[PDB]
Amino acid sequence: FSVNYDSSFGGYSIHDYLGQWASTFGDVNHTNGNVTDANSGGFYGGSLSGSQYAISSTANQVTAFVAGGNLTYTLFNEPAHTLYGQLDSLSFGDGLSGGDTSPYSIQVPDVSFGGLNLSSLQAQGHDGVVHQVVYGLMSGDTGALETALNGILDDYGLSVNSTFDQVAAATA
Numbered sequence: 001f002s003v004n005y006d007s008s009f010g011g012y013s014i015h016d017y018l019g020q021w022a023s024t025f026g027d028v029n030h031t032n033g034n035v036t037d038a039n040s041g042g043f044y045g046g047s048l049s050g051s052q053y054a055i056s057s058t059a060n061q062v063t064a065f066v067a068g069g070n071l072t073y074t075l076f077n078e079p080a081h082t083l084y085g086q087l088d089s090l091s092f093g094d095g096l097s098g099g100d101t102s103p104y105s106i107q108v109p110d111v112s113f114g115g116l117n118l119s120s121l122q123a124q125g126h127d128g129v130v131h132q133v134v135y136g137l138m139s140g141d142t143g144a145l146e147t148a149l150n151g152i153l154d155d156y157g158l159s160v161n162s163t164f165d166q167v168a169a170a171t172a
């Protein structure tokens, strides 16, 4: 675990930031009979595999996120539609660019986390964890993530409620 952040948010608490990233990102809306090309997503390192999954708002068109690590998907195999693997990074920013002949990247990065070590097996599925984080995110719900963030910061004397600055010191 580590954190990099645009200086603007040095004294922002993690809860606030995400609350504001999600205020604008919205609910991409990935539900039965609504999943089209817009909510799609799109990996990098396969068609349902990769070191990156990254979607962008289908509401303001620009703000987005990108989960790194090792994320194997499972479109229809038991269990149905359920991301899993080794979620390692999450970075929040605006304007998502790249991701084909090259990786996915954020044009104007606002914040980003590293070493989430969140592991989720295909056995657990829809009620797993990396699945939960990433999916919530795609729907504009940061709970799953602050919960796990608190988890990483517990063992550190902090919470998704301290300031980026605060979190920082206590890391590097």
Ligand code: HEM
Pocket (backbone or CB within 6 Å): 030, 031, 032, 033, 035, 036, 040, 041, 042, 043, 047, 048, 053, 073, 081, 082, 083, 131, 134, 135
């Ligand atoms: C890792 C990110 C993703 C997660 C966590 C995920 C999760 C899900 C979930 C929860 C639904 C359920 C809809 C429902 O039952 O109400 C959904 C729908 C769907 N997803 Fe994924 N998905 C993601 C990536 C993908 C990718 C890469 C595609 C490619 C287009 C895809 C295509 C679909 C389709 C079309 C359905 C609907 C099938 C149906 O009507 O039953 N998903 N996804």
Ligand SMILES: [Sm+3]
Pocket (backbone or CB within 6 Å): 151, 152, 154, 155
């Ligand atoms: Sm812990």
Ligand SMILES: [Zn+2]
Pocket (backbone or CB within 6 Å): 006, 007, 008
């Ligand atoms: Zn800035």
Ligand SMILES: [Zn+2]
Pocket (backbone or CB within 6 Å): 063, 093, 094, 110
């Ligand atoms: Zn912003």
Ligand SMILES: [Zn+2]
Pocket (backbone or CB within 6 Å): 063, 094
């Ligand atoms: Zn912005």
